[PDB]
Design a protein around this ligand. Structure first.
Ligand SMILES: [Zn+2]
Ligand SMILES: [Zn+2]
Ligand SMILES: [Zn+2]
Ligand SMILES: [Zn+2]
Ligand SMILES: [Zn+2]
Ligand SMILES: [Zn+2]
Ligand SMILES: [Zn+2]
Ligand SMILES: [Zn+2]
Length: 115
């Protein structure tokens, strides 16, 4: 969980460089994001979910402070603000976002579909 976008980028790129065919996942978090609270309580804490994603490759950027660096990263991903979860691949491409709460089964299905 990061609040510094450049630090996040370094960590993500290291993971992608060390294992390029395995993507990472980026969640745009805020203290006020309702779907983030629901995901934490019912979905992203499930062991089946941890196995498909590799939670060592699950990243969160906390944009609550709405700093300029956060606005820029949102723009890079085509968002105005949370919620948003992306599969981010080593070639620079990204999936369509998850835009709200989903249950474990659907979450795994979305991840597997987006390689
Ligand atoms: Zn920094
Ligand atoms: Zn900063
Ligand atoms: Zn900085
Ligand atoms: Zn591999
Ligand atoms: Zn906070
Ligand atoms: Zn926060
Ligand atoms: Zn959220
Ligand atoms: Zn979230």
């Amino acid at each position: 969980m990061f609040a510094d976008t450049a630090a996040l980028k370094a960590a993500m790129d290291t993971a992608l460089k060390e294992h390029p065919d395995k993507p990472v996942v980026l969640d745009f978090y805020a203290d006020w994001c309702i779907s983030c609270k629901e995901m934490a309580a019912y979905t992203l804490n499930q062991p089946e979910v941890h196995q498909a994603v590799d939670m060592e490759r699950f990243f969160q950027i906390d944009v609550t402070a709405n700093k300029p660096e956060h606005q820029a990263l949102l723009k890079e991903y085509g968002l105005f603000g949370p919620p948003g979860v992306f599969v981010v691949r080593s070639d620079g491409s990204r999936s369509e976002p998850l835009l709200g709460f989903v249950k474990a089964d659907k979450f795994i299905e979305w991840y597997e579909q987006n390689r």
